[PDB]
Amino acid sequence: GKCRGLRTARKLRSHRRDQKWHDKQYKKAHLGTALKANPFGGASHAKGIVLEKVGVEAKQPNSAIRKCVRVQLIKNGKKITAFVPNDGCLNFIEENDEVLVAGFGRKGHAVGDIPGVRFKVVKVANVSLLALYKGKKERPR
Amino acid sequence: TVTIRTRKFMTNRLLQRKQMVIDVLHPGKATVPKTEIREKLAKMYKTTPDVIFVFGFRTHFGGGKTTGFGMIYDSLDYAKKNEPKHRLARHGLYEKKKTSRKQRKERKNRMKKVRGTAKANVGA
Amino acid sequence: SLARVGKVRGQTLKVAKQEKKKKRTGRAKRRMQYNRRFVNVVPTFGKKKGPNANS
Amino acid sequence: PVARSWVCRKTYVTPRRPFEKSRLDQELKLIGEYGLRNKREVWRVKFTLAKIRKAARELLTLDEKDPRRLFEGNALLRRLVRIGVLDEGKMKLDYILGLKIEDFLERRLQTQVFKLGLAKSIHHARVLIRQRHIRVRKQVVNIPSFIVRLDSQKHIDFSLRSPYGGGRPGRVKRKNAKKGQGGAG
RNA sequence: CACGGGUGACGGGGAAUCAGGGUUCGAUUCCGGAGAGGGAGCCUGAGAAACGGCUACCACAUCCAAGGAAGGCAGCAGGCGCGCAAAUUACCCACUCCCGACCCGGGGAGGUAGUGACGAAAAAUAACAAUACAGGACUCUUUCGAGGCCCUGUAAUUGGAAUGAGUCCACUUUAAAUCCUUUAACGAGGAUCCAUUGGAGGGCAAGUCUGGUGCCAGCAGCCGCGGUAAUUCCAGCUCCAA
Ligand SMILES: [Mg+2]
Ligand SMILES: [Mg+2]
Ligand SMILES: [Mg+2]
Ligand SMILES: [Mg+2]
Ligand SMILES: [Mg+2]
Ligand SMILES: [Mg+2]
Ligand SMILES: [Mg+2]
Ligand SMILES: [Mg+2]
Ligand SMILES: [Mg+2]
Ligand SMILES: [Mg+2]
Ligand SMILES: [Mg+2]
Ligand SMILES: [Mg+2]
Ligand SMILES: [Mg+2]
Ligand SMILES: [Mg+2]
Ligand SMILES: [Mg+2]
Ligand SMILES: [Mg+2]
Numbered sequence A: 001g002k003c004r005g006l007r008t009a010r011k012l013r014s015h016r017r018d019q020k021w022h023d024k025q026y027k028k029a030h031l032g033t034a035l036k037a038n039p040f041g042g043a044s045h046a047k048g049i050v051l052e053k054v055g056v057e058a059k060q061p062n063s064a065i066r067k068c069v070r071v072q073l074i075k076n077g078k079k080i081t082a083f084v085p086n087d088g089c090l091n092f093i094e095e096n097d098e099v100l101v102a103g104f105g106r107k108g109h110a111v112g113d114i115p116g117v118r119f120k121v122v123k124v125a126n127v128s129l130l131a132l133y134k135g136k137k138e139r140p141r
Numbered sequence B: 001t002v003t004i005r006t007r008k009f010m011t012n013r014l015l016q017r018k019q020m021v022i023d024v025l026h027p028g029k030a031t032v033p034k035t036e037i038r039e040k041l042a043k044m045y046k047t048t049p050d051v052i053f054v055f056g057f058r059t060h061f062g063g064g065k066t067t068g069f070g071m072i073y074d075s076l077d078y079a080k081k082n083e084p085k086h087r088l089a090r091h092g093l094y095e096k097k098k099t100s101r102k103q104r105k106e107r108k109n110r111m112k113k114v115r116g117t118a119k120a121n122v123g124a
Numbered sequence C: 001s002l003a004r005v006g007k008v009r010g011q012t013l014k015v016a017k018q019e020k021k022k023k024r025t026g027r028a029k030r031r032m033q034y035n036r037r038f039v040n041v042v043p044t045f046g047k048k049k050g051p052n053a054n055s
Numbered sequence D: 001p002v003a004r005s006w007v008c009r010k011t012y013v014t015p016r017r018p019f020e021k022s023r024l025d026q027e028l029k030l031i032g033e034y035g036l037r038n039k040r041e042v043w044r045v046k047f048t049l050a051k052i053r054k055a056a057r058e059l060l061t062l063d064e065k066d067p068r069r070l071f072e073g074n075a076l077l078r079r080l081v082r083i084g085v086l087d088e089g090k091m092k093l094d095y096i097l098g099l100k101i102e103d104f105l106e107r108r109l110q111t112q113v114f115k116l117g118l119a120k121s122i123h124h125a126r127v128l129i130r131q132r133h134i135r136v137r138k139q140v141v142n143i144p145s146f147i148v149r150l151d152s153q154k155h156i157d158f159s160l161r162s163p164y165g166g167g168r169p170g171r172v173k174r175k176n177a178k179k180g181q182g183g184a185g
Numbered sequence E: 001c002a003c004g005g006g007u008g009a010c011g012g013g014g015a016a017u018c019a020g021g022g023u024u025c026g027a028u029u030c031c032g033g034a035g036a037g038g039g040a041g042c043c044u045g046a047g048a049a050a051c052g053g054c055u056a057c058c059a060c061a062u063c064c065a066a067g068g069a070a071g072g073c074a075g076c077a078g079g080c081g082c083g084c085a086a087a088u089u090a091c092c093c094a095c096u097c098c099c100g101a102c103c104c105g106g107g108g109a110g111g112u113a114g115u116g117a118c119g120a121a122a123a124a125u126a127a128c129a130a131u132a133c134a135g136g137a138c139u140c141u142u143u144c145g146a147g148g149c150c151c152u153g154u155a156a157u158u159g160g161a162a163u164g165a166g167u168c169c170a171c172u173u174u175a176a177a178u179c180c181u182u183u184a185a186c187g188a189g190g191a192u193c194c195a196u197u198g199g200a201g202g203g204c205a206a207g208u209c210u211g212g213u214g215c216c217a218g219c220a221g222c223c224g225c226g227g228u229a230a231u232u233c234c235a236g237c238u239c240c241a242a
Helices: A009-020 A024-029 A032-037 A129-134 B034-045 B076-081 B085-089 B101-113 B116-122 C007-011 C027-039 D021-033 D039-061 D067-083 D101-106 D109-115 D122-130 D171-184
Strands: A045-056 A066-073 A079-083 A098-103 A119-124 B003-010 B017-025 B052-059 B065-073 D134-136 D156-158
Touching: A024 A032, A045 A079, A066 A098, A066 A119, A079 A098, A119 A129, B003 B034, B017 B034, B034 B052, B034 B065, B065 B076, B101 B116, C027 D021, C027 D122, D021 D039, D021 D101, D039 D067, D039 D101, D109 D122, D109 D134, D109 D156
Parallel strands: A079 A119
Antiparallel strands: A045 A066, A045 A098, A066 A079, A098 A119, B003 B017, B017 B065, B052 B065, D134 D156
């Protein structure tokens, strides 16, 4: 603190308000610009329909094709790119079916070598994607 | 082997009773049926067993003691006058109607539609 | 190219899991852990190796 | 609007660092030296002993000759003497800060059954208690974490309806004996 | 710091996290406000601008003989829709109270069960003995080797004992049940009555083990692994954590 009078509580308090807006994490949680930019709308999960199956290159030091899926959300109609996580799991996802998507780990930030994805697939056709990998359940036909 | 004792005995003559908490020691046996100890209270309190009312038996963890509540009546006619109807029915002195609660409600709402002496007709 | 999905998981060999005796659970498991680590063992020369050390 | 309580409480707390070798080995001694079942039993005893310390420390900072400095001081000390973690001649509320969690694990029913000699090992004692073979003043106790007050510590024996007491043989002996006579004729 | 705007704003008693300060939450059982699809206007009544009262207009919607009539679940269930996202169209006024002309009638208030891994407490999945062994303090012994008074652990070796999960007579419980508790009779050897979920390069506890792939497939919150001897991918064995 710089000012240290007994009757300076309005000065000190109204200076916190101004300087809290230069905090990046405070700035985005207390403005509506970040919330409206979120495809999920502030939810932890969202369901959408598969539009197409796509694969992206990774990044400069790595070299691999990241199996992804382009999905269109139901509550909004916004189109995002999700990453079918595990090895070979892309087979279980076909065009025009409903999947459950979740964040990819870092609160809307890109993760790892995949360039510019914020989302991941956890369930396809209302059956868990991890259960299909383990063979505990099969696709409902 | 079965021995009963009474605690917290107290006579309320404004309800013509005398009520107490009953402690039953039945080591090694299942919980004693109520009909069996209404005899034992009758022998203990010098009265006929049909005016004896007991309830609320809980057997402790371990299986040797059971604490319930009992209440003794001055006469059977007084007993029928001030007693819960469900507790007389356990002894047979009362029989409640076998009309379902739900059935009574739609019959109320049908009589409500009609007016006059035909209120009695619409019932069945 | 999307054609090479599931390549390794498919072309890897398939080995069945051998049958093995069940593992004790709860207090017995922690009882086994206590014996294998604290009351049975003896100090060794210099640095000690780990539980899963192998050559 | 319903008629019930909803008042509940957690009895433990997890440590902040999950993978400390020094801490892991220290609570593996206790879980094996007292035959406990998981780490959460150790954790809830550290947690209760931390309440006692937290109460005394805020009492110690209180100016002495305060009625609550004395009333809640004596009440706290009397409780610890009654369960036998603090011996009688040593009871003034600065002496409970120097107190270990092994003292509380001492007063468990499971530990006492071992030391009274009714069992063979600390693990065997826990088996008898669960299988309803122990009573405390004409009351069978079904749980090994029952904490024994100092006055009832001399009333621990086998239950009256127990094969280890004066009771019937269990299923195994009754069935083996019946087969023995059944097979003989 | 008026006025204006926004609020993903019903207020409070309170909740989570917490050294000392603080930060975030409070639709949610207690108190107070508001509202019954949206507005507006009234009757009766001590008390209403009432909606399980009435009258209009707007939206939606029901029956119809086409002339007309009727409507308000943000009550209890239940249904459609919305969605990441939330239970039975059950039994009873026996308890707690409230209403009435009333000791007697009524109460989806409220109580009791059903679904219920939101979450909180307790707490099984083995214990013991004997042999074979391996170590330890002991003795003799240069050691080795041996004596076991003493242990300690291990071994799909053998052995008898102890129980509850479950089936279920009854009692008890209860308005009637159910559950718990009590207690007969059955109920444990691979006691198959079989414990999972994540990891094993570092952070961070724990394999440079073996087979496969060859910058591919994949892993990786971060650093990074992978290009023909991969401790990091896919698997088996083993180990670690709860
Ligand atoms: Mg609002
Ligand atoms: Mg509120
Ligand atoms: Mg109103
Ligand atoms: Mg509505
Ligand atoms: Mg109105
Ligand atoms: Mg209504
Ligand atoms: Mg109303
Ligand atoms: Mg839910
Ligand atoms: Mg009632
Ligand atoms: Mg009535
Ligand atoms: Mg209700
Ligand atoms: Mg099991
Ligand atoms: Mg591996
Ligand atoms: Mg690590
Ligand atoms: Mg390590
Ligand atoms: Mg790692």
